[PDB]
Design an enzyme around this catalytic site. Structure first.
Site, PDB file in Angstrom:
ATOM      1  N   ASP A   1       5.672 -10.159  -2.573  1.00 11.20           N
ATOM      2  CA  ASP A   1       5.888  -8.804  -3.226  1.00 11.20           C
ATOM      3  C   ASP A   1       7.000  -8.311  -2.861  1.00 11.20           C
ATOM      4  O   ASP A   1       7.025  -7.106  -2.525  1.00 11.20           O
ATOM      5  CB  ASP A   1       4.696  -7.877  -3.148  1.00 11.20           C
ATOM      6  CG  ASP A   1       4.739  -6.766  -3.927  1.00 11.20           C
ATOM      7  OD1 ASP A   1       5.663  -6.636  -4.928  1.00 11.20           O
ATOM      8  OD2 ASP A   1       4.051  -5.755  -3.940  1.00 11.20           O
TER       9      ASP A   1
ATOM     10  N   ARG B   1      10.892  -1.173  -2.843  1.00  7.43           N
ATOM     11  CA  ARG B   1       9.820  -0.490  -2.437  1.00  7.43           C
ATOM     12  C   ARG B   1       8.882  -0.943  -1.061  1.00  7.43           C
ATOM     13  O   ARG B   1       8.597  -0.173  -0.390  1.00  7.43           O
ATOM     14  CB  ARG B   1       8.718   0.042  -3.338  1.00  7.43           C
ATOM     15  CG  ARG B   1       8.009  -1.214  -3.617  1.00  7.43           C
ATOM     16  CD  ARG B   1       6.971  -1.118  -4.991  1.00  7.43           C
ATOM     17  NE  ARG B   1       6.543  -2.305  -5.401  1.00  7.43           N
ATOM     18  CZ  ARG B   1       6.949  -3.169  -6.161  1.00  7.43           C
ATOM     19  NH1 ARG B   1       8.099  -2.824  -7.195  1.00  7.43           N
ATOM     20  NH2 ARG B   1       6.547  -4.375  -6.445  1.00  7.43           N
ATOM     21  N   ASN B   2       9.180  -2.257  -0.938  1.00  8.78           N
ATOM     22  CA  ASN B   2       8.740  -3.014   0.313  1.00  8.78           C
ATOM     23  C   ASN B   2       9.922  -3.146   1.380  1.00  8.78           C
ATOM     24  O   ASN B   2       9.675  -4.055   2.362  1.00  8.78           O
ATOM     25  CB  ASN B   2       7.995  -4.325  -0.033  1.00  8.78           C
ATOM     26  CG  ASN B   2       6.682  -3.894  -0.520  1.00  8.78           C
ATOM     27  OD1 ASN B   2       5.994  -2.968  -0.380  1.00  8.78           O
ATOM     28  ND2 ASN B   2       6.170  -4.698  -1.516  1.00  8.78           N
TER      29      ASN B   2
ATOM     30  N   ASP C   1       5.777  -5.739   5.058  1.00  9.32           N
ATOM     31  CA  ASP C   1       4.668  -5.995   4.602  1.00  9.32           C
ATOM     32  C   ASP C   1       4.588  -7.387   3.704  1.00  9.32           C
ATOM     33  O   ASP C   1       3.993  -7.620   2.751  1.00  9.32           O
ATOM     34  CB  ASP C   1       4.311  -5.062   3.449  1.00  9.32           C
ATOM     35  CG  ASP C   1       3.640  -3.747   4.002  1.00  9.32           C
ATOM     36  OD1 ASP C   1       3.785  -3.437   5.238  1.00  9.32           O
ATOM     37  OD2 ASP C   1       3.223  -2.806   3.302  1.00  9.32           O
TER      38      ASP C   1
HETATM   39  C1  LIG Z   1      10.072   8.550   1.033  1.00  6.30           C
HETATM   40  N1  LIG Z   1       8.783   7.810   1.254  1.00  6.30           N
HETATM   41  C2  LIG Z   1       7.490   8.224   0.797  1.00  6.30           C
HETATM   42  C3  LIG Z   1       6.475   7.481   1.266  1.00  6.30           C
HETATM   43  N2  LIG Z   1       7.252   6.174   1.938  1.00  6.30           N
HETATM   44  C4  LIG Z   1       6.369   5.068   2.537  1.00  6.30           C
HETATM   45  C5  LIG Z   1       6.184   3.984   1.250  1.00  6.30           C
HETATM   46  C6  LIG Z   1       5.644   2.783   1.947  1.00  6.30           C
HETATM   47  C7  LIG Z   1       4.267   2.834   3.127  1.00  6.30           C
HETATM   48  N3  LIG Z   1       4.983   4.024   3.898  1.00  6.30           N
HETATM   49  C8  LIG Z   1       5.763   3.646   5.321  1.00  6.30           C
HETATM   50  C9  LIG Z   1       5.460   2.439   5.932  1.00  6.30           C
HETATM   51  N4  LIG Z   1       6.152   2.320   7.284  1.00  6.30           N
HETATM   52  C10 LIG Z   1       7.018   3.104   7.762  1.00  6.30           C
HETATM   53  C11 LIG Z   1       7.789   2.605   8.962  1.00  6.30           C
HETATM   54  N5  LIG Z   1       7.459   1.250   9.727  1.00  6.30           N
HETATM   55  O1  LIG Z   1       8.679   3.572   9.379  1.00  6.30           O
HETATM   56  C12 LIG Z   1       7.494   4.084   7.076  1.00  6.30           C
HETATM   57  N6  LIG Z   1       8.537   5.093   7.512  1.00  6.30           N
HETATM   58  C13 LIG Z   1       8.981   6.429   7.076  1.00  6.30           C
HETATM   59  C14 LIG Z   1       8.656   6.832   5.672  1.00  6.30           C
HETATM   60  C15 LIG Z   1       9.020   7.805   5.307  1.00  6.30           C
HETATM   61  C16 LIG Z   1      10.024   8.667   5.613  1.00  6.30           C
HETATM   62  C17 LIG Z   1      10.600  10.098   4.798  1.00  6.30           C
HETATM   63  C18 LIG Z   1      12.024   9.518   4.402  1.00  6.30           C
HETATM   64  C19 LIG Z   1      12.971  10.569   3.662  1.00  6.30           C
HETATM   65  N7  LIG Z   1      13.260  11.685   4.885  1.00  6.30           N
HETATM   66  C20 LIG Z   1      11.761  12.279   5.314  1.00  6.30           C
HETATM   67  C21 LIG Z   1      10.822  11.059   5.943  1.00  6.30           C
HETATM   68  C22 LIG Z   1      10.660   8.555   7.191  1.00  6.30           C
HETATM   69  C23 LIG Z   1      10.024   7.171   7.756  1.00  6.30           C
HETATM   70  N8  LIG Z   1       6.500   4.509   5.791  1.00  6.30           N
HETATM   71  C24 LIG Z   1       5.252   5.327   3.240  1.00  6.30           C
HETATM   72  C25 LIG Z   1       8.641   6.577   1.806  1.00  6.30           C
HETATM   73  O2  LIG Z   1       9.419   5.789   2.294  1.00  6.30           O
END
Ligand SMILES: CN1CCN([C@@H]2CCCN(c3cnc(C(N)=O)c(Nc4ccc(C5CCNCC5)cc4)n3)C2)C1=O
Ligand SMILES: [Cl-]
Ligand SMILES: [Pd+2]
Length: 270
Positions: A133, A137-138, A151
């Protein structure tokens, strides 16, 4: 430990610090392990994952190691829900990062993002490990702007029929080659096709592929020979790279080793 020692992580060593939103399996949080190491904490919504199968596969995933793959640190399986603990990526998912227009990216930065992903995929290819996938987005972005693939393989454990069925509302139709949509023929060459779409996402600053078409229309048209247009920010040479991923014959698509070489060649012209 955290990448060392046991990979059953003691939840008493975790502190939750920030909500990060939700992903395929539900809530994700930012936290610290033993008060000092940043981690992402994925809490796995009950009923969303084939958990025994995933836990067995996680032993294989623990043995994968590459700078451009998000590192799996371990699992917390002695409570409800289980947690998966991974490398923290401070700038979040690539799709939303691309869509933040304040970054004012140079195309050299966009090509570097492609290189980062291609290196991760060449490594998985060399281990005979499919992503299954691959999409913006991943992928995730760390505090240094480095893109890493996340993932990998996890679609195999998703229980939501809308994501499993190739005509479901959540299946990655727009990232799939015709032989996946028509015959469920997955291979390294279906990851190649998705990588080309990912490059298109990067050079389009996160536009939805085939946005003017529904999923059903997309599946029909790409099987006839419709292809994504060249993004304005992609040179003809960059477009040829992404375009080569979408050959109607899987065996005429490049490997990730060839794609990486092609990307480095373009980079080396700078
Ligand atoms: C901007 N969205 C909203 C939701 N989502 C993701 C989608 C996929 C699964 N989910 C993960 C998984 N793993 C990690 C990892 N290993 O860090 C992670 N980290 C992360 C996520 C979001 C931020 C926001 C970015 C913009 N400024 C404020 C903070 C920061 C770190 N999110 C959330 C996503 O990216
Ligand atoms: Cl464009
Ligand atoms: Pd209950």
């Amino acid at each position: 430990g955290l990448g060392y020692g046991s990979w059953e992580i003691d939840p008493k060593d975790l502190t939750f610090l920030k909500e990060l939103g939700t992903g395929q399996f539900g809530v994700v949080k930012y936290g610290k392990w033993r008060g000092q190491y940043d981690v992402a904490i994925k809490m796995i919504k009950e009923g969303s994952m084939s958990e025994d199968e995933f836990i067995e596969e996680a032993k294989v995933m623990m043995n994968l190691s590459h700078e451009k793959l998000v590192q799996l640190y371990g699992v917390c399986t002695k409570q409800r829900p289980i947690f998966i603990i991974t490398e923290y990526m401070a700038n979040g998912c690539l799709l939303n990062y691309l869509r933040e227009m304040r970054h004012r990216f140079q195309t050299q930065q966009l090509l570097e993002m492609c290189k980062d992903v291609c290196e991760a995929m060449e490594y998985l290819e060399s281990k005979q490990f499919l992503h299954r996938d691959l999409a913006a987005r991943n992928c995730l972005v760390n505090d240094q702007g480095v893109v890493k693939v996340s993932d990998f393989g996890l679609s195999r454990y998703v229980l939501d029929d809308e994501y499993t069925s190739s005509v479901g509302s959540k299946f990655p139709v727009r990232w799939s080659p015709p032989e996946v949509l028509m015959y469920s023929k997955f291979s390294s060459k279906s990851d190649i096709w998705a990588f080309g779409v990912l490059m298109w996402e990067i050079y389009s600053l996160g536009k939805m592929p085939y946005e003017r078409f529904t999923n059903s229309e997309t599946a029909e048209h790409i099987a006839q020979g419709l292809r994504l247009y060249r993004p304005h920010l992609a040179s003809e040479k960059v477009y040829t790279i992404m375009y080569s991923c979408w050959h109607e014959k899987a065996d005429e698509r490049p490997t990730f080793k060839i794609l990486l070489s092609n990307i480095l060649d373009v980079m080396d012209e700078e």
